[PDB]
Structures are given as structure tokens and as C-alpha cells.
Amino acid sequence: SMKEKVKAKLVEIRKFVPFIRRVRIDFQDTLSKVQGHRLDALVNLLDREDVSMSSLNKIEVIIDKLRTRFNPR
């Protein structure tokens, strides 16, 4: 059943992918080069279905952080 959980957490988190893709571009200049890479790696990650729930929890924290560092509030 916790696979039906992972599937549902993933469907929900994907709502933030436009904001991650937008950050990577709108801050292309003031971002590290490897920071651009990982934001890209994270957006790809969210295309797959075989993500573990612990990975999903980290992404949840990663996305809270981005929302707070860029265009906050």
C-alpha cells in the first residue's frame, strides 16, 4: 500500500515543477553551475515513478527551501 502512498505524494509534489524549472532559468546568472545541474536532475527525478518515499521527503524539504530563498512569501 505504501506504493499507493508514494504514487500519491509524487503526483502532488509535481505541482511545484514549473516553479523549479522557472527558478533554474530566472536565476541562471546568480546560480552556481552545479546548482543549475541539480535543479535539472531534480526535475527529471520527478518524471519517474520508482522514487522512494525517503527521497520524496527530502524533495519536500528541498522545495520548501527554494520557495523561501527565491521570490519568497
Binding site: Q35, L42, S55, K58, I62, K65, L66, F70
Partner: peptide, 23 residues
């Protein structure tokens, strides 16, 4: 093998976790 894949995802995410994105 799923350990190798799970590990690659986690190492990558640990690198975004640790980055404060100091702005």
C-alpha cells in the same frame, strides 16, 4: 539492482539538502 539507483537519487538530493542557496 535497486540499491545502486536508490543510492544515486539520495546522494543527489543530499547535495540539494546541504546547499543553503545562500542568496
Amino acid at each position: 539492482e535497486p540499491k545502486i539507483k536508490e543510492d544515486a537519487d539520495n546522494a543527489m538530493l543530499d547535495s540539494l539538502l546541504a546547499d543553503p542557496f545562500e542568496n
